[PDB]
Structures are given as structure tokens and as C-alpha cells.
Amino acid sequence: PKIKTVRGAAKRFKKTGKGGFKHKHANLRHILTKKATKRKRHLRPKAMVSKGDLGLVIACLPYA
Amino acid sequence: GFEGGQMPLYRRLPKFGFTSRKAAITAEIRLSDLAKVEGGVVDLNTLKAANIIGIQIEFAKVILAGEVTTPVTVRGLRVTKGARAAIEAAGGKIEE
Amino acid sequence: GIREKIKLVSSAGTGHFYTTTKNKRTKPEKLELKKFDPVVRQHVIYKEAK
Amino acid sequence: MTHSMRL
Amino acid sequence: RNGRDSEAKRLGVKRFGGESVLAGSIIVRQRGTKFHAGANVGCGRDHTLFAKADGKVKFEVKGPKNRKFISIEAE
RNA sequence: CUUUAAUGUUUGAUGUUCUAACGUUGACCCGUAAUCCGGGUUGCGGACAGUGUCUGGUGGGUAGUUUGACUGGGGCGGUCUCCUCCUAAAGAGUAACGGAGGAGCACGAAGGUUGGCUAAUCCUGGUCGGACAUCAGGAGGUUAGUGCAAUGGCAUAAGCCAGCUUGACUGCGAGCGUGACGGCGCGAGCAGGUGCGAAAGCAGGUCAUAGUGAUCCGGUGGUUCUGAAUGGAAGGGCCAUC
RNA sequence: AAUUCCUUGUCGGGUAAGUUCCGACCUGCACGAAUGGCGUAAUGAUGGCCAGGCUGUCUCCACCCGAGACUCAGUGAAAUUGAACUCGCUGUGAAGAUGCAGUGUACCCGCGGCAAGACGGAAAGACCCCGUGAACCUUUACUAUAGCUUGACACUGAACA
RNA sequence: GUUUAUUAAAAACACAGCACUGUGCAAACACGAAAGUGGACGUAUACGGUGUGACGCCUGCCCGGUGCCGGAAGGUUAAU
RNA sequence: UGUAACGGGGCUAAACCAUGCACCGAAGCUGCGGCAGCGACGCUUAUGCGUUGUUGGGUAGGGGAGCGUUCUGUAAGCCUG
RNA sequence: AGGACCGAACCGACUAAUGUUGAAAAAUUAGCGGAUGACUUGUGGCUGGGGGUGAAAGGCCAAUCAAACCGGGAGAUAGCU
RNA sequence: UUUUGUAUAAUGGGUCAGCGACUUAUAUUCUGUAGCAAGGUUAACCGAAUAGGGGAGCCGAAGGGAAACCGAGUCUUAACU
Ligand SMILES: CC[C@H]1OC(=O)[C@H](C)[C@@H](O[C@H]2C[C@@](C)(OC)[C@@H](O)[C@H](C)O2)[C@H](C)[C@@H](O[C@@H]2O[C@H](C)C[C@H](N(C)C)[C@H]2O)[C@](C)(O)C[C@@H](C)C(=O)[C@H](C)[C@@H](O)[C@]1(C)O
């Protein structure tokens, strides 16, 4: 058979131009009002995936 | 993606965005295949008859990669800035 | 702990609010707190709400 | 029968 | 009854004498002001001393209390 | 709005009665040589019982499972996250069921700015007033104080007082520091709009380091961003937030 | 005390001497009245204790009679086994040596005996611990469910008050 | 009397007797997706369950907890 | 259990202290012979030949190069009473 | 008369000894208990696996029982040797 | 063999002979090699057929953004030095 994609990985990551992955930062869902606005401003753009993380991510997204 | 019972990386991060259904029916074309079409007119029909886009494609951009030299007439396709510059400099009418 | 969560809502061009904490047993007084609004781009009066 | 066993 | 200790928070002098820094580089992380800010050096809200200009780092003793100061020479 | 009252407009509840549903493991006759069954008379019940669907309770009767780890063996006890000091061998880091203490907050002022001021503890003198309240002077120099544990700091005060205030502001951010990562921290400067100050300037919380939980799932508000033929809408997305 | 920890409680009887036994006393750690209390004739391949008789149980073994063991002829296994030219001691050593070091002793090979050693054989220790093992059992652990039980609708109709 | 066939024959289990409780007969209860069988071709001096265990003397106090029984005015409460 | 606390014999130095000169002593180093890896430096690169230097203990593991067995083609070939 | 008494057949299994690669995968020998009953035995039926049956030990159900055997899921799964 | 460590008195094996354990399928990523090269390649199927057709499709040559959309730029932002 063909390989199945881990679908939560396809909901979490997106492929970019040089083959890296972009993801959303993880602290911005709830109790934000005790977080400073500098924290919430810095957690707002999409980041890139680090390299041991990239090794574990490439296995879960085998197609795209 | 098993990390030893630690919560995995694809489950530690928030899922984001949605999937649009209009992005499947849109195919950008470059200018290099603009000479590949039969005849000198470029519309949806001849772009499908020349195997450039596909059957389910409804919309197209004709963006600037390069290599356009002949007068072509583009009908109903959205054209970018630099692409319409290079097309009108090649000679043919951009839209009618 | 005893600080309740309250929000403070814009007066002019309310498409915006801030959120803060307030103790009820010491201060039942209102916030008004002339903060900045990014929607109307000015410093407006804000008001206490739940 | 726990006589030879180290119990 | 014992058995608790916090994680060590990596304080200390990051950039020593004569080192070339860019502006915005962190020179000293500290709790109080063991070192005080001098020329081209700013003091952060947790008393971090950082480079406000790019040059070389310099340590001095100054003032009537023989206190440590960190200066930067714009090279 | 209120208190009963006739009349019709409609149901409900309760009780009694009737028999024609249904029951009969009552009697009798036939199939039939039959204590099965069916059918026919008749008696007794009778719209009850019982059965189907839906539903509340109960249910170790039965079933599927769970019942943490560290641990000078395991159990019992204690601990599990965060902060400060020592161990820690003068960069950073560094274990033990090693030695000691705290946190799970508070505050629209205890935040910002401007202006001003400077302790502890003793000695002397003086109404009650006395070891210790208030006053005045002297000594001393930070042994004080910091909203809260410890350490580092603090006089240019970060300590104490008063005026005016909301920068406890929005979008970013060169550059670094620290983590395997998720993450965490510091930050000059730029755009917009303010506060204090005569001005240089300072302010995007608090002397600093604890006061905290990822994701999923949903709640609320805004934004046509999408919106399954089309126009909406639902539902998603994004932004703020629980 | 089938119950009592401290404990061989203390006193008495039985014995030359009695942690057991019998009778008492109550300090009942922690008896107790149908998960019965306290008695009780008879019964018991029932538990404990004492006595008489009787004896090789014993002091302390001796002899005899038969069946094996022993030799001869016939037939003929089994467990076990890395290979062996398979000594003692003291030390060392994965920490208790036939095998290493040092040393001492010892012609080669059987047969009958005995079992100190070969950490002898036998059974992938049954105790202990571990596995995000398993099975059964328990319950006011969780989630269900058969059954029992409640009401609504259906089978199900007619009069009245 | 019975019991662990193959390490336990007992003080265990049974027993006659005692008490409580259910059951009015298409009985309770049990085995049965049901029909139907057992109870019983018996019917409260009968049948089932539970505890105790001949006989003698007797079985004291507690209904707070839990279980059962009875009430149901009031509060809460499903499908509809 | 048997001296049994120099390994033993034995030693009045064959013990200890100092000074020195010899010598023994390893798979170390040198000599001679050979093989292989890696890297420089040339000959004309049959991607070789040579000169120089250096390397060559190895578990888990990584990399490279081979031997042999059965069957298929070459092979109705070749060997074989 | 008697779940009376003593005691053979018959039924059982209290003690000891022997056997323990047995003569025997539960015996023999010498004593032992019941022996007209809640007895024993033949022949034939019936009850069945979360089931039966049990004067109850988790005992017995074909040398197998805190869930028989056979076959199939099935090469269950095994961070373990 | 397992180990920090075994002559170990830790495991395993009486011996010989024979058999006995990293496979296959399908996808995906990287490396080597071959073809073609801004192009490459067909699947089923037809076809007397490992030929030749069949370009349905797939990958690549463009990305940014959640998306609409824009496009060598795009996103954030009222707009970015
Ligand atoms: C008829 C002959 C039988 O043996 C016995 O009766 C002897 C008398 C047992 O002891 C019996 C009786 C008794 C009391 O031991 C004497 C009891 O403790 C043991 C459990 O069973 C033996 C030896 C037991 O071993 C012991 O097992 C203990 C768990 C560990 C002990 N080891 C540490 C030394 C070991 O020797 C054990 C398991 O039965 C051995 C296994 C191999 C057997 O099952 C074999 C087939 C035996 O049944 C047997 C040879 O037929």
C-alpha cells in the first residue's frame, strides 16, 4: 500500500520554499490576560521548525 | 512521532488555518508555455486542449517567469503586473 | 486568587477591549483608565465590564 | 510443601 | 523535609574584557548591580547590562565607592 | 393588576357502571382412541392485567477494565511543579530519601513622572507617660527599610513624602542570552497616539529573581476571509478573550 | 481460655525436678449471649495430660532365621555427559578452586564399602522484585448491563358523575 | 453420618431441633430470548430462603450508620 | 584443615640508607624482509607507475572489497565409459 | 425395635513400615472404621463449560479444573529471555 | 552468552549427519549508475504482444499568506527605516 499521512501533522505544519516547515507557536490559546503583551506579540507570527524536530516531522509528513 | 511518552511535537502545537476549495480549481501558468498553445489565442479552452492546466481548472494567472516573444491574445485570464508588461512588449493585446 | 477577571471596553468605536484583574472587597470603584485604542487610533475612556 | 523451599 | 532547589539561571559575565560586541549584545546577567552601566551600556529591567553600541568591552573601577563599571569603545 | 359568578369553547384527573378488545393454567361439546392444541357454547374477570417502544430508579446478579513512579529490596512513611542559599572544587552547569527556607499572590496604587526628604538603636530633658507612644537635642552612620523567603543590590537612592496622572499603550524590532525541543528572558531603535516636566528627558507595570500549565474540545465579541448550483446564512478561519 | 501480648502471670495439685496438664484469682492487650453464652450423660481411627500393665522404644545392643546385596552362567536398562592425562594445603580470583601461584605428597589398574566435595542430578525458583503481564475473587473503584421496578404512547372501547 | 479420587477425616460440613422472613396458588422461587417444566398432581400444620445447630438454663441494652418495612403532606426529578 | 603475614629455598647480608658503574628485562624503539590504507610530489592521466611521509589493538556500530553453493543465459558450446 | 452392639463378605482409608528410574502415574504388608442403613452394588438413563453437580473441599466433570477437551480466529501479543 | 567484571562453582551444549533465523509486496526519502533534459515518464487497456500505441495522470520548472487574493515577490501592519 501507500503510506498514510499523520493527519494531525498535516493540520499543524506547512511546507515552505526551501523544504522547511512552518508552525504556529504554542501559548496563545487561553488565559492570556496574565501574559504580557510583548509575549503575545512575539508568539503571533508563524515560526519555523528546528532540526531534530525536523527529523521527527519529515517522517510524519511523507508526501507534503 | 513517538517521543517516549512525552507529548509529541505534532500534538503539542496548535492546528491553524483551514483549507479553501477554490485553490484546487486555480492553476497559474508561466509565459514559457504561452507559445505552446495551438493558435495564437489563450483562453481556458485552448489551455486545456494544449495540456497546460487540466480539466477541473476554472481560473488561471499568467505570471512572469519568462520567455515570451510572439503576439498572443489572452482572454478572461487574470494577468499580473510584470506579465502584462512582458506580453504587451511582445506585442499582443492583453485582454479583450 | 481573590482578584476577579474583568474587562474594560472602549467607548468610541468599540471593536476593542482590554482585560485586567480587580479586587471586589477593597475597590468597588470604576476603572475609567484612559488607554489607547488601536481601532480608532486615539486615547479613549474605557469602562469596567464582566 | 515448603520444607525444601527457601521461603 | 529538605529536597527542593530551583533551576540555576545562568547568570554571570557573558562578554569579558576586550571582546568585540554588536549593539544589543548582552554583557552581564546579574541580580543586583554588581556591575554598573557606563558609556554605551544600558541597564535592563532585571539589571541586565547590554551593549548600546558596537565596540570593545571595558571594565573599570570608578567613583567614591570603588564600584565596577562597564564601558564600550566604539570600534 | 384583583375576587368570585352563569354560558359555551377543550382537555386532564378520580370514582362508579357496562361489554365488545384482551385474559382464563373454570365447566362442557367436537376434531379424537388425546389432562397437547384449535374451534364452539358458557361463567368469571375486564379496558385492568400482560406485551412492544421510549423513559427515571435500582442492580458485583453478570461483564469489561483501572488501581503511578522514585525508593541503599519492596511495602509503610515522605516526595513529585516553581523560587533563594549551601553542597558546587573563584566562567556556566553539576547528584543524593544531602543541609535550610519559601511560592500557587498582592497593588489603579504599592505603576509613570516631577519636586523634596534621609535611617536603626541608645543617652539626656520634659504633664499624665511608665522599659517602650508624643516633643527637643546629642551620639551613631544604613547595625534601618524594601507588600511577602533567601540572595544580590540600593544614597544619584531601588527607601520615605506630596502634586499631576494612566506607558499596567498599539504595531514591530537590529541584536543577544538560555534550553534537546516545546519554550523562556533582555533589548536599543522605528511608526502612531499619549502622561509627567520649564527643558534635557523618562515611562510599552512594580529593586531583581517565585505567584504557574501544552494541545484538543467548546464559550463570548469583532472582522464578508471562506462559505458545496446561485444569493444569504449555518459552520469553519483570523484577531481579542474565557 | 482453640481467645492472654507482657508471660514460663501468681498461688495450689500432680513430679526428685512440670514453659504442657488440672483447680483457682481477674490485670478480659483484644470473652460474651442464635456469625449464640454457659453447662452436659452418651459418642469420637478427635486434641492435651497423668497412672497401672506390658515390653529391644531405650540403657546397649547381641544372636538366629529367611529375601536381596557378593561370586558364577544367561538376558540386559536408566537418569546424566563441553572435553579431560579429574590429588592435599595456603593464598589469589566474578569475592568458598581437581584445573591459577607457591608448595607438599603421589608406581599403573580394579573389586567391595561409605557418602564430605564435585556450589552432585532432577524441575527456564513456587519465596522476593519487575512486566504500563494474566486469571479468578471482593466491593459504598469506574463504565455498563440481565433482571426487578416507574411513567408515557400502542394493543384500548362505551356511559355517566 | 459426609469431605479435599492422588500429602489435610478434623474442631470442618451435614443433622434432628430452633427462629426470622417470603409465599393465598396461573404461589413465591428456579431453568428457560419464549413456549413451557420443576415447586406439586402439593396448597400456610404447605413450600422457599437465611442464620443457628440435640438436650438443660437462658438469650441483656442500642434503630445513630447501613439494609428492609410502612407513610407520602412538602422539596427535587424522566420520557411526553 | 597445613608451616601459611619473604612465592619458596634460604639469607646476618641475599636486609636497610646513600653514591656510582655495568647488565638483564616488553609484542616499546632500532635493523632486515614483506603487505595494505591515507595524503602530498611528479611521469601522460590503460584513473596507472614511481618517490616521499605517515598510519595499520578493537566491542556496539558505520564504510569498502571479495570467496563459495544451487539455479538461468552464453551452451545443440566445451569436458567426459 | 434400633441411622443399636461384636464381627466376615462388601464398602472405606486412621497409623506405621516398605516401595519412590515402583510389581503399581496412589499399591503392598500388619494392625484400623462402618457393616439393616443418611448402606452398598449391577444395568440403563438425565444434567455440560461461566455451565453442571457438590452432607461445601473452589472439590469432581475421562490420569486434565479459581473455568474440561478438540478445532478455528492464530504466525494473538510479548518494552522479556 | 549475559555482563562493570567470568577459569568461574552463572547460562547452554553427549556426539555426528541433515534441516534451522533480516524475507517478500507496495509506497516514500537518500546514495550510486543509465537514459532524456526545462523537461521527464506513462497506468489500466489495445496489441499476438517483454515491439508499437495509450500522456488519463504524476513530478518539476514560483512563491507568499489561514484564506480571498497578489505574484519575483508576498505576509504582518494605518505604513514599515
Ligand atoms: C517421589 C519422587 C519425587 O520427588 C519427591 O517427592 C521429592 C521428595 C520432592 O520433594 C517434595 C517434598 C518436599 C518436602 O521436599 C522434600 C517439598 O519441599 C518439595 C517441594 O516437594 C522433590 C525433591 C522436589 O524438589 C524440591 O523442590 C523445591 C521447590 C526446591 C528443592 N531445592 C531447593 C533443593 C527441590 O529439591 C520436586 C519439585 O518435587 C522435584 C521435581 C523434579 C519433581 O516433581 C519430581 C518429578 C519429583 O516429584 C519426584 C522425583 O518424582
Domains of chain C: 1-50 (2.20.28.120)
Give the method of determination. cryo-EM
- CATH at B36: 3.100.10.10
Cβ proximity of B25 and B55 under 8 Å: no
Asked if residue B44 is part of any domain, the answer here is yes
Q: What angle do CA B50, B53, B56 make, to 5 degrees?
A: 115
Strand-strand pairing, B41-42 and B73-74: parallel
Length of chain D, in residues: 7
Shortest CA distance to C34 belongs to which of C42, C45, C24, C23?
C45
Pick out the nucleotide with least CA–C1' distance to D1.
Answer: H7
Q: Are strands E56-62 and C46-49 parallel, antiparallel or unpaired?
A: unpaired
Domain that holds residue B28: 21-94
Residue D2 CA, ligand 1 centroid: distance in Å? 10
With beta carbons under 8 A apart, name residues in chain C contacting A33. 5, 19-21
CA nearest to B67, candidates B48, B83, B51: B83
Cell numbers placing A41 = 506579540
Do the domain assignments include residue B3?
Answer: no
How far is the CA of A33 from the CAs of A22, A60, B70, C3, C43, in angstroms? Answer: 26, 34, 61, 12, 21
Provide the domain limits for residue E65: 11-75
Q: Is residue E58 part of a domain?
A: yes
Cα distances (Å, whole numbers) of residue E17 to A36, E27, E35, E60: 35, 10, 13, 10
Question: How many domains does the structure of chain E reveal?
Answer: 1
Q: Is residue E5 part of a domain?
A: no
Cell numbers found for residue E13: 559575565
- CA separation for the pair B81, B68 (Å, rounded): 15
